[PDB]
Write a protein that binds this DNA or RNA. Structure first.
Ligand SMILES: [Zn+2]
Ligand SMILES: [Zn+2]
Ligand SMILES: [Zn+2]
Ligand SMILES: [Zn+2]
Lengths: 797, 797
DNA sequence: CTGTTACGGCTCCATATGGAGCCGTAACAG
DNA sequence: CTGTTACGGCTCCATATGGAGCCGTAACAG
C-alpha cells in the first residue's frame, strides 16, 4: 500500500529514499531543475514502464521499444502508470478533436439510433470507406503543391534551375535529376535555355505531371559506368507527392507542406462523408453542425433535447454518457474549442487538458498518474477548476503525483515532498516531508520559506512611463480577433494577459513577431491578418526567447555558446610556456583537428556493434574523455589546464578568474543568470529547457547596449520556483533598465504584479473575444469591474 | 469494484452481460470453442489494451500497433491487464533463461558485492561491451554456414548449379546470380563446366568468401537495357551472412539456420565474458558454474552460504530477493531447468510457467491476469503447486481470470462462469453463475452435469493385448535420456506418460517420429540419438496430429479439405438442368475461373486504400459475397443452389443428403467428429486449434482401412471439455478398432484410465530421469509403489 | 467406384547523396 | 578592444523476383 524506493542513484540522486502513500494527492516541488523533477519523471515511471512493457507481448515489446533500466537499487509497491507530458505530436489529418475526445463515436451512435433520414451506425463514421467522400478520400481538404511556390522564377531558364526543390536541380550534372532532365529534353527536342514562362504548355505539363508513364530511354554516363535503361518520368508534382506519401518525419513533413496548401474539398466541405449521410437530421441539425458548435453551446443544445418515449428510454445510457463527457470537457475549461476543430491546431497546455479530460472520461482507476505543469496555460478560475477535477480523479481511486508551483495546489495537497536545498551538488537531498502545516513549521525548506512569507515579491513603489514611442497595430482580424486595434508602447516592461484561450498570445506570436522579423531580420514567412503597423522606425532589431534547445550536436558547449572559451583560449595563448612551445591559439580548442584526440575525433565516445544488440556508446580509452592530446594537455597555466577548465565548475570559475576582467564580465553575467550550479562544459543535449532559457537570457544580457531592441518571452514562469520567478523578474527589470524593450505574455500573479503596463484582451476566449478588454496602469486596471484579470490584480494588490 | 460489461456482440455474443467481482479467483469454462473462451480473450483484454495503449505516448502507440475496437457497447470498471498466452517467440540468442527470469542481474550484483578476484558490477554482465568475449561477441557460439550443406554436390559442375541456396542459381540466365557468375568467370578465366571438386582452392575461396571487395566489372545485357558497372562480389558465404543479419522473419531464420550450425565458441565456451571475469570466485564457484546448476541444487547451494559479517549484513536484501526468486521458481515446478540453459529450447507450458514465476517475482499487484490452460503440461502434484501459486498471487491483491478444465481448479475457485449450452448457434448464452455448490445444484449446466457424476467415464471392462508385433528402440541417449531401452508394442491404444519435464515426450517427438518419417515418408531431417530400431516392416505409413492450422490461405474451405465439395459438384453435374445447360463439373467450384466472380476473383472482399489509413477490406458488391456468377448461381437442385450448399450448416446438411451415400459417409464422419456446429464453408483462417484438430481426425477416420498405420497425438486433451474428452476417447477407441495404431503422450486422468498399456519414464525430470520407470497393464502398473503416475492411476481406479 | 501419383496452376511471404544549423577564422569598421 | 559580416568546414538527419503449400485435373491400378 506504499510506493517504496531505495538506493536510487539517478543523476543527482544521493541514494535518497522515501515512502509514498498510495491513493492520495501528493505534490513534489523544488528548485528549477533541482533533480526532484527528473527523479519523479525517470525513476518511478521508468520502473513501471519496464515492468509493464516487458511482461507484455514480446513482439509488441520490441515494437514499442525496450526501455532502458534505471540505476535504482529496487522499487517496491509499484503499479502501471501513464504519463501526460508536454511534447505534443503532429499526428495525421485523419485524427480529429472528437476522435481523441472519445465523443465522435458516441455522437455517431446517437445519431444512428435517434436521427431520421430526410441507417447503419458505420455510415455515420468518416474513418471507414463504407461511408466516405471520394473527392478528398475522407481528408476534408486536398494537399496539393503550389505551382507558384515550386518554380516561381518564370524568367529563369530550365537549365538555370528555377525549381528549388531538393532532388530536382537542373544546373548540376552530378544531380540525380540531371539524367531525367536529359531524357525529357531528348523526348521533347527542346532547348534547356528556354525560359520557364516561354515553355510550351504541353512541355510544362509533361515536366510537372509526367509523360503518362510511357516508355522512355534515359542515358547514363558515369565516371566508370555507362549504359541506358527504359523507364518513365512521373514528373515533379508526382515525385513530390510520392515523397510526401513516403515521408515519416515531422521536419520533412513541415518542409514539404511549406511548398503545398490543402485546399478545402469543395464537394463535401467539412463533411468527408457521403451526401446521404448529411440527410440524417437530429434535432434539426447535422453531424457537422453538432461538431462545429462550441462546447458550451453544444451542452446547451443537448440539454434541450426532446424526442419520442422510445428515444428517451434508449438514451438512458448513450445520452447519459454524452452528458458526462460534456461535463468533463467543461470541467477541463477548454470551452473555446470545437468538436470539428483540427486536432493539430492546439496548444500544449490545451492538449494536456484534453488528454486529462479523456482520461477522466475513460474511468480507468487504480493507476498512477504523473502530470506536468497543470497551472501553465490557465487562469485563476481555471486553476480552481483544475484542482476540482484533480480532486475528483483522486476520488475515482487512483494515486496522483503532480509537479507544479501553484500555491493553491500545495494548499489542497495532502503530502508535499521537497528536495533541495540547492541544485546539482548543492541539492539532491530530501529537505523534509509531511503536510503543509509542518512544512511551514520546517525552517530548512526553501518552499516553506516562501510559503511563510519571509521572502516576498514586493510591489514596485514606482512605475515607469512611456516616452512617446509607440507601435500601432489596428484592424488585425487573425484567428478569432474581431478587427482589434491595440496601442502597444515600447520602452517599458509592459505585458499582455487575459483568460485562457483568448487568442491574444496567438495574435502576438502570429502577426506582430512575423511582421517585425520580416521587416528587420528579413524572415520570409507569411504572417496572418495585418492591416498596418506603425512605429517601425523606433526599433532596429528584434529577438525571440523560446524553450528550444541551444544545440542538437555534441560539438557545442555552453562555454562556447557564451564565448568564454575564446577568452580562455586567448589567455592560454598569452602564456609564456605556450609561446615557447609555439602552440597556436586555435590548438586550445576541441572543435578542430590539431590538438584533438584522433581516436574519437574529440567526441569522447566509441561505437561498438553487436550482432543481436543495438549500437553501444562507451568512453574513449585513448583520451579517457579528456578530449585533448597528451602533449597539448601537458601545458599548465596558473595551476590549471585547458581540460581542467573545461571540466571546471562555474561557481569555482567565478572565484578562479579574479584577474581577468574580459572573461569576468561574462562570468558574472552567467552567475547572475542564476545557473552557477551548471557545469561549464556540460553536453548541449543534456541541457534542460530551464537551462537553455537561462543560457539565452545570459547571452542577451551580455550583449552590448543598443537601446533599440525588443524581447519576447513565451511563458517564462514555466518550470520555475518562487525564488526563480523573483530572479527572472529582477533580470527582466535590469534588462528594461538597460534600454531595451520587454514584451511578456504569461499568467503568473507575481509577474503581473511586477508589470508596469497591463494589456487586457477579452472578454471571453475563442469566439467570445476579439476586442481589447481594457488598458492602462495596473492600479487603474484594477479599478475596472468587468475584467477577471483586473479583479485578480486587485485581490493581489 | 466490479467488471461490468453490457451489449457485447463479439462473434456469438448474443448481447450477453455479467458482473465480475473484483479481487477474487473466478474461472470460466465451457464447451470446446463454445465462444466463452473467445469472449474472455477478446472483449476485456481488448478493451483494456485499447484504453491503455492509446492513453500512452502516441508514437509508441503506433509503434506497438493500434488495437482494433471491439463490438461491445460499453465496458465499465476495467483495469490494465496482461496476457500470458501460449504462442512463444523464437527471440534472439542474446536472450537468456536468467535474463527473462529476472535473476541474472541479481546474481551479477551479488557476485560483484561479495565475490573476490582470484570489480564493477557492469563487468559481471554479458550484455554490455564493457565485459565481453570478442571471439563470439557475447553470443557464446558461432553461427557459420556449413560448406557440406550449401553445395555438397562436388561432382556437379559450376554451371549445373551445385549451390541450391535461393538467389545463387548458376544454371538460370535470368537469375540475379548469373551476372555475378559471369563477372567471376571473366575475372578468373575458368570454364563453368569444371566440377566443384576439381575447382582450384583459390577459385573456391574467391567464390565463397569473395574477392576481397576489389574492383570488378559486371556486364549486364537485358532485353531492353545494356551496360556495365564497377562493383565487388562479397561471395556466397558473405552474402548469406548479410542476408541472415538483415533477416527479420522466423521462417526465414529457420530456413537459413537449416544450412548453418552454431559451433560453440572455443575461447570462452559458455562464458561470453572476458577471462578476468571468471577469476571472481564466490563460494568456490564461477558465475557460469552457478548458472549451469539445477534450480533445486542452486537453492541448496545458496542455502549453505557462509561469508563475513559485512557480507551477511549487505545480503539482507540481495540474498533475500535471491531466495524469494528461487522459492518462486520452485513453486513454478520447473526444477528441471538451468539458469544458463538456452531460452528458446523450452516448451510452451514451460514458457507460460516461467512467465508466471517472473510476474510473481515482480510483485506488480492491482491488475487483471488472464492465463490459458495452466493444467496443460503438468502432473497432479504440479497442479497442486500451480493452484497454491495462483492462490498466493490472488492474495497479492489482483483479480485473476483463468480458463481451464481441471476439476481441482474449479473446486478451489470462488465464482464459476459457464456459457453454453452448445456451441455456435446452439450456445453463446450464460447458463448459470455462482459458486460450485449451486452450480452443481443447477440442472442446466453441462459442467455441473459432469461435476455431479451423472455422466462419467466408465473404465473399460476388457483391455486389448499385443499381437506379437513390437517396435524396439534400445540405447537412445538423446537429450536427458541415459541410454534407455523401450519396448513399444503396436496394435493397441498404448500411451506414454510421466512427470512434467521428464523428456519422454521430447524423445518421442525427436527420435521415433523422425526415424519413422525418414524410413517411410522420406523426410530428410536429421534425428537425435538412435542406436537401432526394430519392427520396421510391421508398419507401412505414419502420420502426425498437431495443432497447426489446416490452411493459411482463404482459397481453402473445410468442405474442400474433407472432399465433400467434389461429391457435391459431381451431384450438381449429374442434374438434368446442368446437362441441358452444358455446364462442366468444374464450373461448380470457386477455386478456378469459369464461374467465379471476376470482380473479386472469388475472394469476396475488396481492398480500399486511403492516404492516412491502412488497407481496408469490404465485401464485394458485384457478387455480394456469394462468390459465384449469376448465370452459374441460377441453377437449382432439390430446392438448393451451390452457393446455398456452401453457406449451409453441417447439422442441416446431414439431414439434407439422406439419399447420397457417397457424400453421406463423409457427412456422418464429420458429424461423429463432434463439430457439426461448424459452418460447412467457414474461412480456413477463422478455424481454431480445436476445429483444426477435429478436421484432421475426421479426415483420418474417413481414410480407407489399411491396418498398417500409426497416429501420434500431441496433448489432445488441451482445449476440451469433459464431454469433449469423452468424445475424443471414443474416437480413439474406434480408430484403434479400425486396425491402426495409436500413440498418445498426454497427462489427462481420463485418458490414462482409458488406456490399455501405460509406459512410464522417470523417476525425475531433467537429469533425474533417462531410465524407464516401469511398464505393463494399468492394473499391474498401479501395483508399483515407486511411481507417481502409478499412484495417481491407483487413486483414480 | 476408389485409392494413389504426377503435373499444372494459383496465392502469400520473404529479402547512397543532398540539405540545415553551428563553430571557428579572417576581414572591416567604430 | 569590440562588434558585425562573410566564408569555409564540419556534423546529423532525411528519402522487384524467387520459393513453399494447397487445389484442381488427368492418368493408372485394384
Ligand atoms: Zn470530399
Ligand atoms: Zn579519444
Ligand atoms: Zn567467445
Ligand atoms: Zn465479386
Amino acid at each position: 500500500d506504499y510506493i517504496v524506493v531505495k538506493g536510487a542513484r539517478e543523476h543527482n540522486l544521493k541514494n535518497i529514499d522515501v515512502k509514498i502513500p498510495r491513493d492520495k494527492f501528493v505534490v513534489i516541488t523544488g528548485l528549477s531543475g533541482s533533480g526532484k523533477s527528473s527523479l519523479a519523471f525517470d525513476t518511478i515511471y521508468a520502473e513501471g514502464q519496464r515492468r509493464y512493457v516487458e511482461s507484455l507481448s514480446s513482439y509488441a515489446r520490441q515494437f514499442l521499444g525496450q526501455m532502458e533500466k534505471p540505476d535504482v537499487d529496487y522499487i517496491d509497491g509499484l503499479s502501471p502508470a501513464i504519463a501526460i507530458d508536454q511534447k505534443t505530436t503532429s499526428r495525421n489529418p485523419r485524427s480529429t478533436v472528437g476522435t481523441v475526445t472519445e465523443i465522435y463515436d458516441y455522437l455517431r451512435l446517437l445519431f444512428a439510433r435517434i436521427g431520421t433520414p430526410h441507417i447503419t451506425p458505420r455510415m455515420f463514421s468518416f474513418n471507414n470507406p463504407y461511408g466516405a467522400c471520394p473527392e478528398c478520400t475522407g481528408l476534408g481538404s486536398l494537399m496539393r503543391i503550389d505551382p507558384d511556390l515550386v518554380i516561381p522564377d518564370k524568367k529563369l531558364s530550365l537549365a538555370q534551375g528555377a525549381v528549388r526543390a531538393s532532388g530536382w536541380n537542373i544546373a548540376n550534372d552530378e544531380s540525380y535529376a540531371r539524367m531525367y532532365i536529359d531524357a525529357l529534353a531528348k523526348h521533347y527536342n527542346f532547348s534547356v535555355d528556354t525560359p520557364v514562362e516561354e515553355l510550351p504548355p504541353h512541355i510544362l505539363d509533361i515536366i510537372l505531371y509526367g509523360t503518362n508513364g510511357e516508355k522512355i530511354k534515359i542515358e547514363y554516363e558515369r565516371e566508370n559506368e555507362k549504359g541506358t535503361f527504359m523507364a518513365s518520368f512521373p514528373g515533379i508534382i508526382n515525385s513530390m507527392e510520392r515523397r510526401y506519401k513516403e515521408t515519416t518525419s515531422e521536419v520533412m513533413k513541415q518542409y514539404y507542406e511549406n511548398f503545398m496548401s490543402n485546399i478545402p474539398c469543395p464537394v463535401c466541405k467539412g463533411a468527408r462523408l457521403k451526401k446521404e449521410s448529411l440527410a440524417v437530421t437530429i434535432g434539426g441539425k447535422n453531424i457537422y453542425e453538432v461538431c462545429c458548435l462550441s462546447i458550451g453551446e453544444a451542452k446547451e443544445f443537448f440539454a434541450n433535447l426532446n424526442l419520442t418515449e422510445r428515444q428517451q428510454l434508449i438514451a438512458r445510457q448513450i445520452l447519459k454518457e454524452i452528458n458526462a463527457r460534456l461535463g468533463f470537457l467543461v470541467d477541463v475549461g477548454l470551452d473555446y474549442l470545437t468538436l470539428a476543430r483540427a486536432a493539430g491546431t492546439l496548444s500544449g497546455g490545451e492538449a494536456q487538458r484534453i488528454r486529462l479530460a479523456t482520461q477522466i472520461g475513460s474511468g480507468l482507476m487504480g493507476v498512477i498518474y504523473i502530470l506536468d505543469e497543470p497551472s501553465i496555460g490557465l487562469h485563476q478560475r481555471d486553476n480552481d477548476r483544475l484542482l476540482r477535477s484533480l480532486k475528483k480523479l483522486r476520488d475515482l481511486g487512483n494515486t496522483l503525483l503532480v509537479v507544479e508551483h501553484d500555491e493553491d495546489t500545495m494548499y489542497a495537497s495532502d503530502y508535499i515532498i521537497d528536495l533541495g536545498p540547492g541544485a546539482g551538488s548543492h541539492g539532491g537531498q530530501i529537505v523534509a516531508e509531511g503536510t503543509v502545516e509542518e512544512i511551514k513549521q520546517n525552517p530548512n525548506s526553501v518552499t516553506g520559506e516562501y510559503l511563510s512569507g519571509r521572502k516576498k515579491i514586493e510591489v514596485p513603489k514606482e512605475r515607469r512611463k512611456p516616452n512617446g514611442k509607440w507601435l500601432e497595430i489596428i484592424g488585425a482580424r487573425e484567428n478569432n480577433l474581431k478587427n482589434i486595434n491595440v496601442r502597444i508602447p515600447l520602452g517599458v516592461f509592459t505585458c499582455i494577459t487575459g483568460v485562457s484561450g483568448s487568442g491574444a498570445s496567438s495574435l502576438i506570436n502570429e502577426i506582430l513577431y512575423k511582421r517585425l522579423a520580416a521587416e528587420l531580420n528579413r524572415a520570409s514567412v507569411k504572417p496572418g491578418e495585418h492591416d498596418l503597423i506603425k512605429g517601425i522606425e523606433y526599433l532596429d532589431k528584434v529577438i525571440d526567447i523560446d524553450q528550444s534547445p541551444i544545440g542538437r550536436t555534441p560539438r557545442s558547449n555552453p562555454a562556447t555558446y557564451t564565448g568564454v572559451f575564446d577568452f580562455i583560449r586567448e589567455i592560454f595563448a598569452n602564456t609564456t610556456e605556450a609561446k615557447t612551445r609555439g602552440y597556436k591559439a586555435g590548438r586550445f580548442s576541441f572543435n578542430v583537428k590539431g590538438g584533438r584526440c584522433e581516436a574519437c575525433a574529440g567526441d569522447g565516445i566509441n561505437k561498438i556493434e553487436m550482432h543481436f544488440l543495438p549500437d553501444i556508446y562507451v568512453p574513449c580509452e585513448v583520451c579517457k574523455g579528456k578530449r585533448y592530446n597528451r602533449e597539448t594537455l601537458e601545458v599548465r597555466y596558473k595551476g590549471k589546464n585547458i581540460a581542467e577548465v573545461l571540466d571546471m565548475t562555474v561557481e569555482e570559475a567565478l572565484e578562479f578568474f579574479k584577474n581577468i576582467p574580459r572573461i569576468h564580465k561574462k562570468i558574472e553575467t552567467l552567475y547572475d543568470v542564476g545557473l552557477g550550479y551548471i557545469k561549464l562544459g556540460q553536453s548541449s543535449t543534456t541541457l534542460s529547457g530551464g537551462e537553455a532559457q537561462r543560457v539565452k537570457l545570459a547571452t542577451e544580457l551580455s550583449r552590448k547596449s543598443t537601446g533599440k531592441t525588443m524581447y519576447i518571452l513565451d511563458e517564462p514562469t514555466t518550470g520555475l520556483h518562487m525564488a526563480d520567478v523573483h530572479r527572472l523578474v529582477g533580470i527582466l527589470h535590469r534588462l528594461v533598465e538597460a534600454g531595451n524593450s520587454v514584451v511578456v505574455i504569461e499568467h503568473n500573479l507575481d509577474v503581473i504584479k511586477t508589470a508596469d503596463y497591463i494589456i487586457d484582451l477579452g472578454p471571453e476566449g475563442g469566439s467570445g473575444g476579439g476586442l481589447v478588454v481594457a488598458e492602462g496602469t495596473p492600479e487603474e486596471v484594477a479599478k475596472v469591474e468587468n475584467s477577471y484579470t483586473g479583479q485578480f490584480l486587485k485581490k493581489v494588490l
